[PDB]
Symmetry: C3
Subunit: 155 residues, 3 copies
């Protein structure tokens, strides 16, 4: 069994909605990024790559490479997962923590769990996503961006 | 074995002391929250709920529900744990990281470990709590609030 | 199997280079600290101590103790590891996440993995280090300091 950890942040910018955990969540502003800026999945991705000792998403899919511009993060999640399984690993379970003052993630978590579980080909019970606020404190507290953390256990 | 991760932040406000890890720590200002605002235990709670795939504390005990106003977080910790065990899980071990510029957590960690170990009905050796500063950097660095992180492994 | 988590931050100050993961990385400014201020290794250290239920680096090697002034963090990593093994633990694997806007950590990760793997006496495949930016957001985003997170699994 191997443990992995990921972390990611993206600044707000442009018009909404945002894409978090694969779900299109309506919001005033959107998120600035080379890909779709899905903070939730980038963190999950790194956590998986991390546990598999495959590095990180920024080594696998560079900002530099314009092929990744506008990239659907689920697409990136599946590839990393493809490569992870190839190295011989299987999913133990994953946990994700979105840190944002707004929008409300809560109602969207189930659909997120559906997308992720599909993408990893695991049962939803092996996928958990949760959310928290920094109580107005911080760049997140000030609504300047959204951060996310994730842990994974591969077998 | 399942892995979980939690994270929480609370802003300073009012008069002290604060309650971190169940311990009443003397401080100038206190912590703003719907419950007792015990950052340490909320993070631990989510980490456990997370590993058990039971969501998060904000789904289990809403800000909205006035029954939780002033709630003793150990009380919330025990319930989540009750439900977690009901799902068939047992404690592997937990690790908590308090991130605060002040007050000094260090002297209080043992008592915190005593409360948590009791609450989870595990041996203290399965419970670890530590502390760190952001070296004046950040909302925590500026003494605007206290954040905490936690990881848990259920069996 | 036990899980551990660590976290650390250090402010920029003085002239560079910085020392992250044991590697001397060239940078304009350096990092302020009592030891060499190697954020990466302090976080890794706490993660290991954490999983072993041995507390944290600030309890083991105090700021107060002037013997630790200028301390090479690898030296601290090895001791904590010494004590950790003495308690009967062996390395499962570790994952580290450096959070910095600059300098570029990426090219240095391999050497970091070499130092850490040596220090823990494990194969490099059991050691993973990755890096991320807060996209200009935060004290890290503003280039005020560098933070790092880490998870470890002991057996
Ligand atoms: Zn990202
Ligand atoms: Zn809280
Ligand atoms: Zn440090």
């Amino acid at each position: 069994m191997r443990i992995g950890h990921g972390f990611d942040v993206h600044a707000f910018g442009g018009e909404g909605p945002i894409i978090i955990g694969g779900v299109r969540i309506p919001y005033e502003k959107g998120l600035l990024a080379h890909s779709d800026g899905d903070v939730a999945l980038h963190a999950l991705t790194d956590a998986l790559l991390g546990a598999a000792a495959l590095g990180d998403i920024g080594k696998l899919f560079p900002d530099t490479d314009p092929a990744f511009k506008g990239a659907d993060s689920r697409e990136l999640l599946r590839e990393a997962w493809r490569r992870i399984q190839a190295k011989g690993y299987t999913l133990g379970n994953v946990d994700v923590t979105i840190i944002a003052q707004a929008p409300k993630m809560l109602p969207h978590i189930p659909q997120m769990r559906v997308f992720i579980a599909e993408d990893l080909g695991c049962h939803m019970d092996d996928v958990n996503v949760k959310a928290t606020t920094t109580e107005k404190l911080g760049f997140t507290g000030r609504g300047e961006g959204i951060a996310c953390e994730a842990v994974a256990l591969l077998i």
